[PDB]
C-alpha cells in the first residue's frame, strides 16, 4: 500500500541511478501511480493525479523541469483516454501503452545522438554550459565516431556542474579546458559553436535551465555564432514569461535583506534564467532538428483546444 | 541569372505601369555572362537601368532601400541556396543598412532538408576564369565559388506562388508537402 | 644600503597598509629609489631605473597595473629633468617635487569623490564588479552625503573580491545584494547604472583589470545603460591590443593540457580581459570627467614625441 | 524652431540649385506654432515641402535617409540640448534605420559643462495646452516636455562654423575655448 507522493514511490529510484533524470522520473512515478492504483473509474483517476501532481509541484517548487513532466503526463493520458474506448479497454489500453516512456523516453538521448551527429563537424571548438546530459550523449557519440573537435566547459555557478563535465569527458579522452563563466566574452571569438540544454521549453522557445544561459546566449548573438541547444521531445511546459523573469526560487532577484549571522551571499540572486526565440537558432528533438518557430507551433498544436 | 525576375519585371512594368530603376551587379566572373544579358533585355523594356560593378555595390547601397534576390533552392531554416556568385555578402551589406531583403521562389524550389554544413552545399568553380596565366613555378593559389548561402536573418520574405512568408515559417509549407521518413532518404534506416 | 628591487624596499610597505594600491606603491618605491641612490650624474640615474623597472616587470609579470606605474614614472622624470636645469638643480629640483604623488596620488580617490558625486543620483541601483577602490571611496562619499541609492555586487571569480565588497559596505550601512556573475544578464534590465575600474587604460581606452568586465560591458551596451568606469589620472599604459587578447598570465586562453594529479581547473582561462572604446561611455580622472576619445588623445599627447 | 536652417535652406536652394523636399513634423503642441510657419516660408521658396503629423514620422522614415536637427545647446559628450518637443524619439527612430543624423550649431552654442542628470536639463511645460478642460474632481495627471536630450550615439556630425566634427571630438573645440577652473563656476571652491 503506497501513496506515490513524495518518497514512498518517487524518491526511491532517484537514488537508484543518475542516468534517469528528473522529469521522466516523475513520468516513471506517474505511470506507476495509476498502474497499481487503478480505481476502475475514469473520474477519480484524473482526480487522483490532479491531487498528486499539484502536491508534487508543492513537493519541490523550484525544479520546474518536473512541472513540464507534470504538464505532458496529463497530455499523455488525455489523448490516451481518447480513441473512445469507454474506459473499458482504456484501463488496459493505457497500461498496454504503459511502459512506453521507460522504453522510449529513455532512448531519447541516443536518438539525439543518432541525429545530432552533423552539428559538431570537423574541428569545432565547442562551448558547453551546465549538465544537460543529452549533450554528453551527443558528445559520447562524437568520441565513438572518432570525429575531430575540441571542447570548452564553462562554469555552472553556483550549481557546480562544470567541474563534473571536465572530469566526465577527460576520462573519455577529449582535449578540453574548463573556463570560468566570467571569461566567456574574451574567448567567444575563437569559439565557433555553442551547446546548452534547457530544463523546459517555453511557448516562444524557452531556456529555463540555469543561471546564465541567457548571458552566454546574448554573447553568442553579438559573436554571430549558431547558438544551438540540445533537448528532447518531452521537455515542454506552458510556463511562459514576457521578460527574462520566470517564477523565481522564493523571492525577487533584487533582495536587500541583510546577513543575520553567516548566511550565503552568492545565493541571493536567481538560479534560473530565460531566453526567448531571438537568441537561439536551432534545437534538437526526438522528432528531429527543429527551428525556433516550429517549437512554438508544436507547443500550441495540442495545447489550445 | 533568375529567369523568374527576368520574366517578372517585364509585367511589373507592363501591366502595373510603375516606373523605377534597377541597379544590377555582375556575378563575377560567371553570371557576368548573363548580367550583361540581363539589363539589355530590360533596356528593351527601358526600366531606367544601369550596371554597377561588384565593388561599387556598397557605395550605392545608401541610396537603394529595397533588394530582391532570385534564389535557386531553399531549406527548412529559411536559409536559401542561392545562385552562383557574389550574392551573399551584398545580402549581408543590405541587412546592415536595415534594408528589406526580398526573394522569389517557386513551391517546387522548396527542400525539406537541413543545412548541416554550409560548406557541403557551397560548391566552388575553377581556377581558369579567375586568373588565366596558370603559373607552374611561381604557382600561387586562388579560390572560386559558384554557390552562396545566406542565413535567414538576412532575408525577410518569400514571394512564392502561395503567398509571402516568414523566414521561420518555411517548415509548415514544407511539412505540408514532405514527410519525416524520406527526408533521411537512404536504405540504411540506422 | 638597500637595492630597491624586490622586497628590500618595495614589499616592506605593501604589508604596511591596504590603502595604498599596487602602482603608486611602485611609484613610492621609484621616487625613493633615486632619492637615496642619487648617483650625482644624469646618465646612470635613468640607467638605474631602466635596470630597476625591467626587473620589476620581471619580478611580477602579471600585475600590469605596475607596468602603468613603470610607464609613467619615466614620463614623470623625463619632463621633470626638462625645464633645462643642467642636472645641477635637477637633482634637488626632482626631489623637491619628490613626495608629490605620496601627497597627490594618495588624494586621487577623494578628488574622485569630489567630482564623481553627480553620477550616482537619486535611486540608482548600482552594479559594481571587482575591488577598484576608487569606486568605494566614491561610495564612501555617497553614504556620507546621505544621497539615496542601492547597490548590487557581482562576483569577482576567481579573484574572490566580490565577497569583500559585500562585507565592506554592509557595515557602512547600504542595502546591497551579492549576485553571481552568471546572473547578470537576467537582472541587468532592472539595473540602471554600472561602475567598474581598470588596472590600466589602453590607447583607445582600455579596461585591463579583471576577468569579465568586458562580459558585463557588452551586456550593458545591449541593455543600453551608461557603462561608466572609475579610475584616476595615473592609471595609463601604452600596452594596447587589437582584439580582447592582451599579454596573458602565462599561456594561451585555450589550453588543452591535462590534469596531472589535482591541479586547479577553474584557473585555466585568463584573468585579465580587455574592453575597447565602444562599450564604455565615460570615465573619471583627477583632471575631471573624460570622454573615451579624450582618453586616447591625452594618452598620446605626451607619448608620441 | 531653428532660425539657422530656416535661413540655411533658403540659400541651399538658391545658390546651390539643388532640388529636393523636406518633410516637417510639429513640436506638438508647442512648435506647431512655428511648424506651420516653417514650411509656409519654404513654400514661398517652393522646396516640394509637406507637413507630416508627429505620429506618422515612423511610417515615412523608411523612405527618408537623412535627417537634420537644429539644436539649442551642446555639451561635452556630444549629447546636445535640443529644441522644445518631439525631437529625441524621432532622432532615436532615425538611428534605428541606420540613417545619418545631422545637426547644426554655432560655436557660441557650445557649452563646457557635463550632463550629469538628463532630468536636471530636461525642462517641462504646462498642463494648459496639453488638455484644456482642467477637471478638479476626476482630476487626472498629465505631462508636458519643452526640452529633449539625445545621446551622442544617436548623432553623427556637427555642422559648425569651423567644420564638421565627431560626436566625441567636442571636448577639443571646447577646451580650446574654456578652462578647467570656471567650469565649476561657484564661489565655494570645495
Author numbering:
A (entry chain A), C (entry chain B): 1 to 305
B (entry chain E), D (entry chain F): 192 to 381
The authors write:
Eukaryotic protein synthesis typically begins with a specialised initiator methionyl transfer RNA (Met-tRNAi) that is delivered to ribosomes by the translation factor eIF2 as part of a larger preinitiation complex (PIC) with multiple other translation initiation factors. Only by re-engaging with GTP can eIF2 participate in further rounds of Met-tRNAi binding and protein synthesis initiation. This requires the action of eIF2B. eIF2B first removes eIF57 and then acts as a guanine nucleotide exchange factor (GEF) to activate eIF2 and facilitate Met-tRNAi interaction and rebinding of eIF53. Structural studies of eIF2B have shown that it is a decamer or a dimer of pentamers. eIF2B has a central hexameric core comprising an eIF2Bα homodimer and (βδ)2 heterotetramer that is linked to a pair of γε heterodimeric arms. Here we have used single-particle electron cryomicroscopy (cryoEM) to resolve the structures of eIF2αP/eIF2B and eIF2/eIF2B complexes from Saccharomyces cerevisiae to an average resolution of 3.9 and 4.6 Å, respectively.
The yeast strains used are deleted for the sole eIF2α kinase Gcn2; hence, eIF2 is purified uniformly dephosphorylated at the ISR regulatory site. The 3D map generated for this eIF2/eIF2B complex is remarkably similar to the eIF2αP/eIF2B complex, with two eIF2 molecules bound one at each side of the eIF2B decamer. Therefore, to build the atomic model for this complex, our eIF2αP/eIF2B core model (eIF2B with eIF2α domains 1 and 2) provided the initial eIF2α/eIF2B atomic coordinates. Hence, the eIF2B subunit structural models are highly similar, with only very minor rearrangements. When the Ser52 loop of eIF2α is examined closely, one clear local difference is loss of the density associated with the S52 phosphate. Specifically, R53 is reoriented in the unphosphorylated complex. In addition, there are minor movements associated with R55 and R64, the latter moves away from S52. The density around R54 is weaker in eIF2/eIF2B than in the eIF2αP/eIF2B complex structure, suggesting that it may adopt more than one position. Overall, the weaker density in the S52 phospho-loop of the eIF2/eIF2B complex prevents us defining precisely the positions of the side chains. This likely points to enhanced flexibility of this region of eIF2α in the absence of the phosphate group.
